[PDB]
Paper text:
In crystals obtained by cocrystallization with a molar excess of ATP and GlcN, the substrates could be easily located in the electron density map, at the active site of the enzyme. Interestingly, this structure represents a snapshot of the phosphoryl transfer reaction in which ATP is hydrolyzed into ADP and inorganic phosphate (Pi), with the two hydrolysis products clearly identifiable in the electron density map. The ADP moiety is located in a cleft between the two lobes of SjGlcNK, which adopts a closed conformation, while both Pi and GlcN are found at the C-lobe. The adenine group binds to the hinge region, cross-linking the two lobes of the enzyme. In particular, the adenine establishes hydrophobic contacts with Y187 and L188 at the hinge, with V131, P164, and V185 at the intermediate subdomain, and with L307 and V316 at the C-lobe. The catalytic residues D317 (in the DFD loop) and Q305 (in the catalytic loop) coordinate the two magnesium ions, stabilizing this transition state. In this complex, the leaving phosphate is stabilized by D300 and the two magnesium ions, being perfectly oriented for transfer to position 6 of the bound sugar substrate, GlcN. Six conserved residues—W195, D300, H302, E409, Y412, and W420 (W222, D322, H324, E430, Y433, and W441 in MtMak)—mediate binding of the two sugars. In SjGlcNK, the amino group of GlcN is within hydrogen-bonding distance of the side chains of Q405 (K426 in MtMak) and E409 (E430 in MtMak).
Residue numbers in the entry:
A (entry chain B): 4 to 8, 14 to 20, 33 to 63, 72 to 90, 96 to 104, 111 to 116, 121 to 141, 143 to 441
B (entry chain A): 1 to 19, 26 to 89, 94 to 117, 121 to 433
């Protein structure tokens, strides 16, 4: 059977639930010794075995599981496995406790119900409705062929700008269209309601952002760490102003908004990856957050695109790239605010959170670097170099 | 016994208002500033309702006549600054001194006083209550704002009427050894092309021009900002489409062929102006280009604040986007490079064409930096750069077909590098 039959839960133990897909394929919810639950495709199913294909077949042909549908495999990394070059099956590797799961089902459903179309077409949905909290197990959306994520087309656009193949207005147009897309996304997501942030909510932000700042200061080495340590008192002072921001509107957000989540194909843009920030606990990715968190996530990512272009491109002229960094963030912010005005949704964006959340986003770049990609410390170092002394001169005036 | 100024002016020959052409008589004296000792400044209206600023001097030969260089009327105006009808406003600025000695100069009637000051009589005036030259408003705002990159203003004589005071006379410092930008900027690029200057040395004036423009706009913005209405940006597109139509239907040769093919793409850029409603409008230079900048010994001075001549006389005082001056200067910097390549034998075009692109970046960077340093980023809307830049190059076509036909090469080469 499947119950009796360690690293199985990790891509490349007791059983809680099993959805037999037939022919040896199954979607299992495995609990670890540390009370950690996992969604393990069983055949572990690798891209090509057919488990992702059997999931689409089981969803297209219809009590502990829920297989919803809406009307060969090649994987690429949660784990996203393309099926038939037409649908993307995304598994949920890590599962919460027996509590809230991935909010991607509620995010996509609210966007589709609000008229938001700048996203891949949803196909199916697999949900574990057995415990006290229904946990999302798999999502199936339409596969956009020949599509590239932001870390590919935005880098290519800025590289063409540095080579003179594009004008500044041509290079800034994607940043402006991303601003209008983000406003339509927030306007559709805010339809589910708004929640004023309590004094305990803004206090939890300060302690969390100060804790991460202390971790980065104590982990970033060499000259980059010395510059960050000198900046840390200034950053900590900005974190203290969060206590006076209680009552700011909290809505359903993307949670992990950056250019890599924006796919471009045939001149059209689509948003993906509504599973929440992976660095956040599983019981917080579905919580309502400020819309400015997505705004600072995208504007910081646009800044980082320019840093990457200068870093990786031989013989690059950094002058138009660095000018693009400032102009792309303005083009994004201007189009985002004006689109919220045309949608009568100006109330969900609180620009007082720009500087504190932007600083916290760059600190996470330090933490991501020391944990996954050590040389990446140059990106938040260059971003804060152009951002911190400018914002400090205004506070001292 | 002695007749008043009104009686003398009415009995004077209509040519009194002229420094050949004929004015209809008789004349009528609307306002008179008594400068003492037989000198005066009159606001005279002819039989065709045309108003004039006339420097007047009483003369025992003909009763009254128009002041000439040497009569002492410009001296008396300057002396009146170094120190009162209700219709006149005399504002003096730091540096005015009662210098003596007059000499005529052509630069709308200018008189050199003391060989260190320039008195300029505004010969032709607008109608009563109608807008005119905003030069007095511009110069006074720059002086009160601490702007010094201009000829030191000594004083302004204005007529207290209308929404803005009507300029009657201006007194500024005389700069006998100063060239305009079409001399020194062309000379800088030529020296760059033949290796006498480095690229960094040839780009420094472009950055200094950006700082000057930002200081100028920040001072001019101190009088206030006006948000552009939807009808304003709609009228901009109408005026720019008409100028584009006039250019396409007039420019000949291969330049006209390229402009005709570019016209649909240019009109598409003009269509995005409707989304720019609310952009800030301030007092601007209005006719801003390198020819308006004097340079000597590392010092820069902007002149000519009466507005755009091709614009209607009652519209040159209206508030305009600060980006219009920016576009005017960046375009003129482009044209400086085009002129160097066109006129210099055996010139190396590569360093000049690199300077064209780099000078515009140096100008914008210094302009943005100085605006931020003065906390005046709000007045510059860079979304207007491309549509207004295309409109400036189209105006070069119109200036060419009307005054200098071969000049069509300048906007042709500029648009060739600006279009994608
Ligand atoms: N429907 C789709 N069609 C084409 N490409 C997609 C689709 N969904 C995701 N991708 C690509 O897969 C990559 C990662 O997917 P994502 O869901 O963001 O993974 P994760 O959330 O684990 O980072 C993205 O860069 C995106 O380009
Ligand atoms: N800040 C994180 C980093 O991990 C990186 O900049 C990017 C790619 O992982 O994703 C962002 O959410
Ligand atoms: Cl890198
Ligand atoms: Cl010429
Ligand atoms: Mg992702
Ligand atoms: Mg994700």
């Amino acid at each position: 059977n499947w119950s009796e039959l360690p690293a199985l839960v990790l891509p490349s133990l007791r059983l809680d639930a099993l959805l037999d897909l037939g022919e040896g394929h199954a979607v299992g919810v495995v609990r670890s010794a540390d009370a950690a639950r996992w969604t393990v495709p069983l055949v572990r199913s690798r891209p090509g075995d057919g488990t992702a294909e059997h999931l689409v077949a089981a969803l297209a042909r219809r009590a502990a599981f829920v297989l919803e549908a809406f009307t060969g495999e090649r994987g690429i990394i949660n784990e996203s496995v393309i099926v038939g070059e037409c649908a993307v099956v995304k598994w949920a590797v890590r599962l919460p406790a027996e509590e809230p799961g991935s909010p991607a089902a509620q995010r996509i459903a609210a966007l589709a119900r609000g008229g938001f179309t700048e996203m891949p077409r949803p196909w199916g949905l697999l949900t574990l409705a057995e415990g006290a909290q229904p946990v999302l197990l798999a999502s199936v959306v339409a596969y956009l062929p020949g599509a590239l994520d932001g870390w590919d087309w935005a880098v290519d656009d800025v590289r063409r700008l540095a080579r003179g193949e594009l004008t500044m207005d041509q290079a800034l147009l994607p940043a402006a269209q991303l601003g209008t897309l983000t406003a339509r996304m927030h306007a559709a997501l805010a339809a589910r309601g708004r929640t004023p942030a309590t004094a305990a909510d803004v206090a939890a932000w300060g302690v969390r952002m100060r804790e991460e700042l202390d971790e980065a200061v104590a982990s970033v080495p060499g000259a980059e760490g010395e510059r960050l340590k000198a900046w840390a008192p200034r950053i900590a002072d900005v974190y203290a102003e969060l206590d006076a921001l209680a009552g700011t509107p909290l809505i359903d957000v993307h949670g992990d908004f950056h250019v890599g989540q924006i796919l471009r194909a045939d001149g059209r843009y689509a948003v993906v990856d509504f599973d929440g920030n992976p660095v956040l606990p599983a019981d917080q990715r579905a919580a309502r957050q400020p819309a400015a968190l997505d705004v600072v996530g995208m504007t910081a990512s646009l800044d980082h695109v320019g840093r990457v272009v200068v870093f990786r491109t031989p013989d690059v002229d950094p002058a138009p790239v660095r000018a693009w960094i400032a102009a792309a963030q303005r083009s994004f912010l201007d189009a985002y605010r004006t689109t919220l005005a045309r949608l009568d949704a100006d109330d969900l964006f609180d620009d007082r959170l720009l500087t504190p959340l932007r600083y916290a986003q760059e600190v996470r770049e330090y933490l991501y670097a020391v944990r996954h990609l050590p040389h990446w410390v140059y990106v938040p170092d260059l971003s804060l170099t152009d951002l911190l002394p400018e914002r400090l001169k205004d506070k001292l005036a």
